[PDB]
Amino acid sequence: XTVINLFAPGKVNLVEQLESLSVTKIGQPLAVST
Amino acid sequence: XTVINLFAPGKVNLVEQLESLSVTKIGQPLAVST
Amino acid sequence: LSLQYILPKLWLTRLAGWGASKRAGWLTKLVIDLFVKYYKVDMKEAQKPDTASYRTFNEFFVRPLRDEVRPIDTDPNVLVMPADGVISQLGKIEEDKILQAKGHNYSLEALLAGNYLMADLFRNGTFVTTYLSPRDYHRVHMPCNGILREMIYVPGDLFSVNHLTAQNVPNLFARNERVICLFDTEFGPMAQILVGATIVGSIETVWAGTITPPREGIIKRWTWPAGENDGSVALLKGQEMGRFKLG
Amino acid sequence: MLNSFKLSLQYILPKLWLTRLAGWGASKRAGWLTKLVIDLFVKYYKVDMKEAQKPDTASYRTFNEFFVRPLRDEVRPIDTDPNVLVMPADGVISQLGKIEEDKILQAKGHNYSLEALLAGNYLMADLFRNGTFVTTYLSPRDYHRVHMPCNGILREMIYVPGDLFSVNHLTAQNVPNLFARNERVICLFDTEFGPMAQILVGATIVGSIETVWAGTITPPREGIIKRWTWPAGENDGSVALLKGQEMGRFKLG
Ligand SMILES: CCCCCCCCCCCCO[C@@H]1O[C@H](CO)[C@@H](O[C@H]2O[C@H](CO)[C@@H](O)[C@H](O)[C@H]2O)[C@H](O)[C@H]1O
């Protein structure tokens, strides 16, 4: 296994199509700066 | 079981006759202000 | 020593806690009588010396004493012993280092579960480790007047906490389940840390009741305000502040 | 309240003895038997060996060598927008979204404390109150190394002792504080997007955690919280990693 990321308030937006059971691949987009 | 006390530096002196395996009773002397 | 690592210490603790909480009349009384026999308990010191007087074994384990048998020293410059038993170790905290036994040190920061700001209060200070046995009174009393500021529940193991394990198990007091209490006093900031052991795994304070069980596996911190504020908690020298029981 | 054999096993099984036993076996150079276990694992979990640098299961001298097998660079291209934080691990999203004050979702309906995840470190909890979280779940079939979502200066690492519960829908729904009570390593970085935590949480059998700067953190299991600090990035002794670079991994033991 498990990896948990924490980001500061107001700093990133999660990619909007990601939800529970979305496939993850190293290097694919996870979030964007605000 | 076990009770551990911590005191800040220079605040108390342990009563001098206490050492490993000294009998303790609630209310007896343990330490004195400096 | 090998047993300490193999034995299901927590299963045994839970089992004993279940039995010691039962109002089981004659059977309760039998276990208490056998315990009193085996461990040479002085029932003369108890408020209720009659072993039938206790409805559960835990009621007996935490039996109150008669005031007169533990006179509280009267010099307001004297800090008093918090618990009946023996000194395990005591003296100076050598920077971050506390003596567990000859040849075994442990970290002040590790004892305080990584709380480096609370470790800073006590670097190069003084420590006292009291060992309470099955025969001893199992409540713990204030060494001086104190305002409660901070309590930290720390999860951990339930190693036995005797002179053999003190000599052989690294970080025994920093890895065993425990409650850290931090007070303001006249003699500066003061910690009173209640560390559990196999079977004797239950820890109470007078202000929060039973902290454990249940065992939820996380660090919990509570704070209280400075003296003379609403929700403030203040205790007197020699007053009860907590206890140990089975489970 | 819930009457489940499987949940009972989580509490009954000597999870640590099993983890040690498996770690012992996974470190052995056992030739044909090593290769057999790897082939059976690859078959049963549908591993894509095409993605590995060494796709041949005979190339691995121990099971752990295989479990931590590297991939071909080309197969995980790092997004190039410097405004894009990338996935740190192959697997699935477990949960993600807003940290509701101190509250993180472990499963639908089931919360846990940010302070509890961070072992009572209220000052590090304050950095992330009302912030954002992502929980990635890595399975036996996945690549088992973990990479940076962005450039970071390492400031803080905390080893936290704990249990080795399994991680699945039953444990996520039924074991309170699953990720806050399981053995784990907390890493805190300065980034362009402010402070960022990347926490590596172990599970039954997959109990070993490494970082690239400190090697194997666990085992051995010494029962205490350990904290390390590093200075700001302008200073001698600082540690710096790039977006997509390896920062740690998991293995058996
Ligand atoms: C959890 C995954 C499980 C993976 C499979 C585990 C199987 C465990 C089997 C236990 C026995 C294997 O233990 C292994 O024995 C072989 C003997 O052939 C040794 O093999 C080693 O030494 C011998 C000579 O002494 C050499 O010929 C050999 O080239 C070398 O690699 C290993 O040093 C030892 O690790």
XYZ file of C-alpha atoms and ligand atoms in Angstrom:
603
model
C 1.486 -3.387 -0.850
C 0.000 0.000 0.000
C 1.229 3.558 -0.840
C -0.523 6.611 0.674
C 0.130 10.163 -0.635
C -0.820 13.293 1.365
C -0.747 16.800 -0.268
C -1.214 20.215 1.433
C -4.621 21.956 1.147
C -5.202 23.946 -2.094
C -2.001 22.588 -3.760
C -3.237 19.866 -6.228
C -6.402 18.631 -8.025
C -6.651 14.835 -8.456
C -7.157 13.789 -12.132
C -11.022 13.864 -12.320
C -11.542 10.353 -13.916
C -9.717 8.502 -11.034
C -11.872 6.559 -8.505
C -11.692 3.350 -6.386
C -10.366 0.454 -8.647
C -8.946 2.795 -11.350
C -5.787 1.071 -12.766
C -2.522 2.852 -11.717
C 0.711 2.786 -13.775
C 3.917 4.560 -12.686
C 4.327 7.754 -14.760
C 0.607 8.242 -15.681
C -1.094 11.451 -14.384
C -2.311 11.470 -10.721
C -2.832 15.201 -9.984
C -2.118 18.758 -11.318
C -0.854 21.939 -9.545
C -3.589 24.622 -8.980
C 3.458 -3.250 36.423
C 5.972 -0.466 35.638
C 5.937 3.318 36.332
C 8.567 5.640 34.767
C 8.930 9.281 35.967
C 10.985 11.912 34.041
C 11.942 15.372 35.553
C 13.547 18.307 33.618
C 17.295 18.911 34.229
C 18.296 20.562 37.564
C 14.735 20.468 39.053
C 15.073 17.579 41.627
C 17.708 15.426 43.432
C 16.773 11.747 44.009
C 16.958 10.893 47.773
C 20.586 9.590 47.916
C 19.998 6.121 49.558
C 17.718 4.923 46.646
C 19.372 2.430 44.205
C 18.401 -0.662 42.122
C 15.901 -2.864 44.160
C 15.258 -0.223 46.901
C 11.746 -0.880 48.369
C 9.153 1.807 47.360
C 5.944 2.732 49.257
C 3.420 5.389 48.092
C 3.935 8.598 50.130
C 7.615 7.929 51.146
C 10.310 10.404 49.896
C 11.557 9.941 46.256
C 13.206 13.323 45.442
C 13.639 16.940 46.709
C 13.538 20.336 44.882
C 17.025 21.918 44.256
C 13.418 -15.627 27.348
C 12.449 -17.741 24.226
C 8.852 -18.044 25.650
C 8.533 -14.196 25.632
C 8.740 -14.221 21.755
C 6.722 -17.459 21.149
C 3.788 -17.045 23.668
C 0.543 -15.436 22.375
C 0.918 -12.775 25.114
C -2.154 -10.783 23.989
C -4.501 -13.849 23.733
C -3.456 -14.810 27.328
C -3.989 -11.139 28.459
C -7.525 -11.044 26.881
C -8.416 -14.502 28.375
C -7.313 -13.446 31.921
C -9.146 -10.079 31.517
C -12.382 -11.949 30.601
C -12.089 -14.216 33.717
C -11.029 -11.387 36.085
C -14.120 -9.270 35.111
C -16.650 -12.107 35.932
C -18.798 -11.829 39.141
C -18.157 -15.594 39.770
C -18.709 -15.821 43.577
C -16.950 -18.905 45.095
C -14.663 -19.291 41.997
C -13.641 -15.590 42.051
C -12.903 -16.044 45.821
C -10.898 -19.299 45.215
C -8.632 -17.657 42.540
C -8.128 -14.615 44.917
C -7.271 -16.939 47.898
C -4.787 -18.966 45.713
C -3.217 -15.685 44.396
C -2.942 -14.241 47.969
C -1.306 -17.560 49.098
C 1.158 -17.900 46.132
C 2.267 -14.175 46.075
C 2.193 -13.521 49.900
C -0.290 -10.555 49.689
C -0.634 -8.553 52.988
C -4.484 -8.241 53.221
C -4.011 -6.433 56.632
C -3.188 -3.318 54.493
C -6.481 -3.489 52.450
C -9.681 -1.546 53.382
C -11.647 -4.860 52.921
C -9.248 -7.610 54.213
C -12.049 -10.222 53.558
C -11.430 -11.947 50.152
C -15.219 -12.754 49.871
C -15.717 -8.903 49.859
C -14.471 -8.795 46.156
C -17.188 -9.530 43.482
C -14.488 -9.967 40.672
C -10.701 -10.835 40.731
C -9.952 -7.388 39.102
C -11.807 -5.635 42.009
C -9.334 -7.500 44.301
C -6.264 -6.797 42.029
C -7.056 -3.028 42.278
C -8.062 -3.303 46.031
C -7.789 0.057 47.874
C -5.544 0.380 50.996
C -6.285 2.128 54.336
C -5.026 5.795 54.173
C -3.129 5.388 57.498
C -0.887 2.604 56.002
C 0.600 5.004 53.328
C 1.222 8.370 55.039
C 2.013 11.108 52.427
C 5.266 12.972 53.390
C 4.307 16.598 54.419
C 7.349 18.718 53.111
C 6.003 20.503 49.978
C 9.679 20.335 48.724
C 9.543 16.481 48.817
C 8.321 14.482 45.774
C 7.002 11.069 46.975
C 7.085 7.548 45.484
C 4.142 6.952 43.087
C 3.903 3.113 43.470
C 4.511 0.234 45.955
C 7.194 -2.242 44.796
C 10.960 -1.854 44.138
C 13.140 0.609 42.164
C 14.104 -1.100 38.842
C 16.617 1.669 37.809
C 16.926 5.452 38.417
C 19.328 8.393 37.969
C 20.383 10.809 35.195
C 19.116 10.687 31.584
C 22.504 10.658 29.731
C 21.496 13.001 26.841
C 18.716 10.766 25.214
C 19.868 7.552 27.035
C 17.991 5.790 29.928
C 19.352 2.630 31.645
C 17.009 -0.407 31.410
C 19.600 -2.774 33.036
C 23.462 -3.073 33.197
C 24.582 -3.043 29.498
C 21.079 -2.125 28.111
C 20.247 1.562 27.278
C 17.111 2.885 25.530
C 16.124 6.153 23.822
C 13.993 8.821 25.629
C 12.479 9.655 22.164
C 11.586 5.925 21.674
C 9.973 5.776 25.214
C 7.885 8.851 24.213
C 6.841 7.278 20.832
C 8.822 9.737 18.618
C 7.564 12.876 20.471
C 10.867 14.842 20.038
C 9.319 18.041 21.599
C 8.413 16.117 24.834
C 11.845 14.374 24.677
C 13.479 17.872 24.663
C 11.778 18.644 28.059
C 13.731 15.737 29.668
C 17.148 15.532 27.800
C 19.895 15.319 30.544
C 17.137 15.221 33.228
C 16.288 12.550 35.854
C 14.316 9.279 35.613
C 12.864 6.711 38.044
C 11.594 3.242 36.985
C 9.449 1.478 39.651
C 8.572 -2.261 39.223
C 5.173 -3.378 40.715
C 4.797 -7.195 41.315
C 1.573 -9.290 41.537
C 1.691 -8.987 45.400
C 1.880 -5.123 45.338
C -0.911 -2.512 45.486
C -1.652 -1.812 41.771
C -2.859 1.834 41.894
C -0.435 4.738 41.169
C -0.394 8.082 43.008
C 0.972 11.594 42.271
C 4.584 12.302 43.439
C 3.611 16.029 43.798
C 0.747 18.438 42.920
C 0.322 18.515 39.131
C -1.827 20.048 36.372
C -2.439 17.363 33.674
C -1.442 18.852 30.239
C -0.992 15.810 27.949
C -1.805 12.074 27.856
C -0.476 9.795 25.056
C -1.716 6.187 24.624
C 1.019 4.163 22.859
C 0.234 0.704 21.407
C 2.870 -2.025 21.705
C 3.692 -5.574 22.869
C 2.929 -7.124 26.316
C 6.315 -8.588 27.219
C 6.690 -9.577 30.912
C 8.481 -6.710 32.711
C 10.611 -8.647 35.292
C 14.424 -8.466 35.954
C 15.144 -11.285 33.383
C 13.244 -9.512 30.501
C 14.699 -6.114 31.690
C 18.168 -7.719 31.119
C 17.435 -9.516 27.792
C 14.652 -7.701 25.755
C 15.968 -4.567 23.954
C 13.761 -1.430 24.319
C 11.405 -3.333 26.733
C 9.748 -0.146 28.151
C 9.762 1.669 24.757
C 8.032 -1.238 22.906
C 5.429 -2.381 25.568
C 1.890 -0.849 25.503
C 1.870 2.234 27.807
C 0.249 5.590 28.778
C 2.417 8.765 28.983
C 1.022 11.465 31.339
C 2.598 14.982 31.273
C 2.003 17.495 34.127
C 3.038 21.051 34.995
C 4.430 21.072 38.563
C 6.395 23.426 40.894
C 9.505 21.313 39.960
C 8.959 21.860 36.181
C 7.377 19.526 33.585
C 7.003 15.943 34.892
C 6.081 12.631 33.141
C 4.469 9.615 34.850
C 4.435 6.698 32.349
C 2.323 3.587 33.095
C 3.764 0.598 31.161
C 1.744 -2.644 30.863
C 2.953 -6.269 30.880
C 1.674 -9.786 29.941
C -1.755 -10.403 31.649
C -1.536 -7.045 33.585
C -2.304 -5.166 30.316
C -5.208 -2.882 31.444
C -4.323 0.785 32.312
C -6.713 3.387 33.828
C -6.360 7.015 34.844
C -8.813 8.659 37.308
C -9.713 11.344 34.670
C -10.367 8.964 31.676
C -11.226 5.543 33.231
C -9.895 2.443 31.370
C -7.573 3.568 28.462
C -6.958 -0.050 27.309
C -8.586 -2.365 26.496
C -9.847 -2.077 23.861
C -6.570 -2.224 21.769
C -7.140 -0.189 18.538
C -3.415 -0.162 17.419
C -2.987 3.666 17.046
C -1.250 6.436 19.032
C -3.881 8.712 20.694
C -3.006 12.150 22.154
C -5.262 14.190 24.508
C -4.490 17.712 25.811
C -5.817 19.664 28.812
C -5.591 23.426 29.462
C -3.305 25.211 32.024
C -4.477 25.446 35.712
C -7.628 27.455 36.719
C -9.199 27.011 33.214
C -12.544 25.254 32.363
C -11.847 21.527 31.642
C -8.542 21.799 33.642
C -7.500 18.624 35.602
C -5.457 19.069 38.822
C -4.299 16.344 41.257
C -2.605 16.568 44.696
C 0.613 14.885 45.938
C -0.154 11.265 47.053
C -3.633 11.318 45.366
C -4.503 8.306 43.095
C -3.907 9.138 39.360
C -4.310 5.657 37.739
C -3.971 1.861 38.105
C -3.217 -1.494 36.375
C -5.548 -4.567 36.110
C -5.881 -7.815 34.059
C -7.037 -7.717 30.386
C -20.504 -8.263 15.946
C -19.390 -9.641 12.486
C -19.003 -13.492 12.596
C -16.329 -14.258 9.921
C -13.739 -17.131 9.967
C -11.469 -15.084 7.636
C -11.622 -11.923 9.831
C -10.885 -14.184 12.893
C -7.751 -15.570 11.107
C -6.435 -11.957 10.729
C -6.408 -11.810 14.590
C -5.616 -15.540 15.252
C -2.747 -16.271 12.749
C 0.856 -15.556 13.864
C 1.184 -13.059 10.962
C 4.778 -12.132 12.017
C 6.048 -15.781 12.200
C 4.495 -16.403 8.728
C 6.128 -13.159 7.393
C 9.578 -14.265 8.813
C 9.154 -17.835 7.387
C 8.262 -16.508 3.881
C 11.133 -13.952 4.028
C 13.558 -16.837 4.870
C 12.271 -18.882 1.857
C 12.250 -15.871 -0.514
C 15.982 -15.162 0.255
C 17.096 -18.773 -0.625
C 19.027 -19.603 -3.843
C 16.985 -22.862 -4.288
C 17.485 -23.260 -8.091
C 14.682 -25.379 -9.701
C 12.432 -24.928 -6.562
C 12.894 -21.109 -6.584
C 12.011 -21.247 -10.340
C 8.947 -23.512 -9.692
C 7.496 -21.162 -6.990
C 8.091 -18.135 -9.366
C 6.436 -19.994 -12.341
C 3.416 -21.019 -10.139
C 3.149 -17.417 -8.791
C 3.356 -15.941 -12.345
C 0.652 -18.414 -13.542
C -1.718 -18.013 -10.511
C -1.479 -14.134 -10.328
C -1.215 -13.484 -14.134
C 2.142 -11.552 -13.946
C 3.084 -9.801 -17.244
C 6.783 -10.872 -17.538
C 6.917 -9.060 -20.965
C 7.203 -5.814 -18.887
C 10.257 -7.042 -16.848
C 13.895 -6.312 -17.917
C 14.579 -10.120 -17.562
C 11.326 -11.805 -18.773
C 12.830 -15.313 -18.107
C 11.912 -16.718 -14.631
C 15.229 -18.756 -14.647
C 17.122 -15.392 -14.539
C 16.019 -14.913 -10.816
C 18.339 -16.565 -8.195
C 15.809 -16.029 -5.275
C 11.989 -15.427 -5.106
C 12.595 -11.897 -3.558
C 14.851 -10.990 -6.570
C 11.810 -11.850 -8.758
C 9.259 -10.095 -6.411
C 11.312 -6.838 -6.730
C 12.098 -7.396 -10.503
C 12.837 -4.119 -12.399
C 10.756 -3.100 -15.499
C 11.969 -1.719 -18.883
C 12.117 2.166 -18.725
C 10.160 2.417 -22.028
C 7.169 0.530 -20.459
C 6.517 3.312 -17.821
C 6.898 6.665 -19.605
C 6.906 9.582 -17.077
C 4.363 12.289 -18.049
C 6.397 15.426 -19.057
C 4.031 18.330 -17.899
C 5.939 19.625 -14.833
C 2.455 20.606 -13.460
C 1.503 16.858 -13.474
C 2.183 14.672 -10.391
C 2.372 11.027 -11.583
C 1.321 7.701 -10.053
C 3.970 6.318 -7.637
C 2.930 2.617 -7.956
C 1.425 0.035 -10.359
C -1.907 -1.356 -9.085
C -5.380 0.101 -8.438
C -6.643 3.198 -6.569
C -7.995 1.916 -3.195
C -9.462 5.332 -2.154
C -8.624 9.011 -2.886
C -10.039 12.518 -2.449
C -10.179 15.275 0.198
C -8.904 14.890 3.770
C -12.080 15.992 5.659
C -10.333 17.898 8.478
C -8.334 14.929 10.053
C -10.448 12.241 8.262
C -9.267 9.863 5.468
C -11.472 7.170 3.862
C -10.167 3.542 4.273
C -13.349 2.133 2.596
C -16.871 3.463 1.730
C -18.317 4.610 5.106
C -15.097 3.903 7.127
C -12.764 6.784 8.189
C -9.413 6.995 10.017
C -7.361 9.797 11.570
C -4.497 11.583 9.722
C -2.796 11.972 13.167
C -3.123 8.163 13.741
C -1.628 7.441 10.224
C 1.311 9.748 11.164
C 1.879 8.041 14.575
C 0.694 11.009 16.754
C 2.911 13.554 14.874
C 0.364 16.449 15.186
C 2.864 18.950 13.571
C 3.135 16.759 10.394
C -0.680 16.185 10.579
C -1.204 20.003 10.527
C 0.609 20.181 7.118
C -2.152 17.988 5.580
C -5.429 18.910 7.470
C -8.126 19.569 4.759
C -5.596 18.518 2.054
C -5.708 15.656 -0.499
C -4.900 11.936 -0.287
C -4.347 8.948 -2.578
C -4.174 5.290 -1.433
C -2.727 2.919 -4.100
C -3.130 -0.875 -3.547
C -0.292 -3.060 -4.988
C -1.189 -6.791 -5.516
C 1.109 -9.845 -5.847
C 1.002 -9.492 -9.691
C 2.163 -5.800 -9.636
C 5.672 -4.304 -9.872
C 6.714 -3.860 -6.177
C 8.967 -0.753 -6.389
C 7.612 2.777 -5.697
C 8.582 5.948 -7.579
C 8.354 9.737 -6.998
C 5.128 11.521 -8.145
C 7.198 14.747 -8.583
C 10.669 16.179 -7.774
C 11.219 16.181 -4.003
C 13.762 17.055 -1.297
C 13.537 14.389 1.482
C 13.097 16.201 4.873
C 11.781 13.490 7.231
C 11.378 9.688 7.492
C 9.491 7.942 10.341
C 9.558 4.134 10.817
C 6.350 3.063 12.662
C 6.075 -0.457 14.180
C 2.702 -2.179 13.873
C 0.744 -5.255 12.803
C 0.887 -7.100 9.451
C -2.841 -7.370 8.637
C -3.700 -8.423 5.062
C -5.103 -5.657 2.785
C -8.329 -6.638 0.887
C -12.068 -5.589 0.892
C -12.774 -7.621 4.121
C -9.897 -6.001 6.120
C -10.502 -2.499 4.567
C -14.191 -2.676 5.713
C -13.759 -4.596 9.000
C -10.341 -3.712 10.615
C -10.529 -0.182 12.087
C -7.394 1.964 11.457
C -5.946 -0.759 9.079
C -3.305 1.593 7.488
C -2.698 3.485 10.793
C -1.926 0.269 12.766
C 0.063 -1.757 10.079
C 3.909 -1.414 10.077
C 4.894 1.488 7.738
C 7.489 4.110 6.664
C 6.416 7.783 6.414
C 8.522 9.940 4.036
C 8.058 13.770 4.007
C 9.393 15.858 1.062
C 9.525 19.550 0.129
C 8.079 19.856 -3.424
C 6.934 22.625 -5.831
C 3.341 21.676 -4.733
C 4.183 22.154 -0.998
C 4.905 19.416 1.589
C 4.155 15.880 0.341
C 4.019 12.534 2.247
C 4.604 9.169 0.569
C 3.863 6.410 3.115
C 4.771 2.749 2.408
C 2.547 0.404 4.459
C 3.337 -3.326 4.764
C 1.010 -6.356 4.883
C 1.165 -10.065 5.937
C 4.167 -11.774 4.178
C 4.978 -8.576 2.130
C 6.376 -6.992 5.339
C 9.841 -5.751 4.158
C 10.195 -2.001 3.243
C 13.260 -0.328 1.620
C 14.035 3.236 0.555
C 16.835 3.984 -1.971
C 18.606 6.301 0.595
C 18.516 3.914 3.654
C 18.236 0.349 2.160
C 16.026 -2.145 4.103
C 14.228 -0.314 7.000
C 12.528 -3.569 8.193
C 13.182 -6.332 9.013
C 14.501 -6.541 11.612
C 11.505 -5.376 13.760
C 12.820 -3.593 16.922
C 9.384 -2.448 18.297
C 10.083 1.379 18.423
C 9.314 4.555 16.413
C 12.509 5.897 14.677
C 12.741 9.397 13.141
C 15.398 10.686 10.667
C 15.618 14.301 9.357
C 17.439 15.824 6.351
C 18.108 19.545 5.694
C 16.449 21.863 3.114
C 17.603 21.387 -0.539
C 20.028 24.387 -0.529
C 22.202 22.644 2.129
C 25.001 20.019 2.309
C 23.652 16.566 3.371
C 20.295 17.070 1.511
C 18.653 14.149 -0.450
C 16.906 14.919 -3.795
C 14.849 12.672 -6.110
C 13.271 13.386 -9.525
C 9.701 12.750 -10.759
C 9.343 9.050 -11.769
C 12.632 7.995 -10.061
C 12.556 4.887 -7.720
C 12.299 5.911 -3.989
C 11.608 2.512 -2.305
C 10.102 -0.992 -2.607
C 8.358 -3.885 -0.786
C 9.499 -7.549 -0.478
C 8.805 -10.713 1.611
C 10.068 -10.982 5.245
C 8.503 -17.853 -0.370
C 9.144 -18.315 -1.654
C 9.662 -19.736 -1.534
C 10.778 -20.005 -2.549
C 11.297 -21.451 -2.453
C 11.913 -21.787 -1.099
C 12.550 -23.170 -1.095
C 13.375 -23.359 0.173
C 14.229 -24.632 0.121
C 15.232 -24.653 1.284
C 16.605 -25.172 0.887
C 17.347 -24.273 -0.110
O 18.583 -23.816 0.464
C 19.626 -23.629 -0.497
O 20.300 -24.865 -0.697
C 21.209 -24.770 -1.802
C 21.792 -26.166 -2.007
O 21.450 -26.653 -3.306
C 22.315 -23.700 -1.631
O 22.914 -23.498 -2.934
C 24.179 -22.772 -2.918
O 25.279 -23.533 -2.364
C 25.606 -24.728 -3.124
C 26.852 -25.450 -2.599
O 26.860 -25.544 -1.171
C 25.849 -24.400 -4.607
O 25.911 -25.581 -5.419
C 24.777 -23.518 -5.216
O 25.247 -23.225 -6.532
C 24.566 -22.284 -4.330
O 23.590 -21.356 -4.865
C 21.789 -22.372 -1.043
O 22.830 -21.581 -0.443
C 20.657 -22.590 -0.034
O 19.974 -21.357 0.103
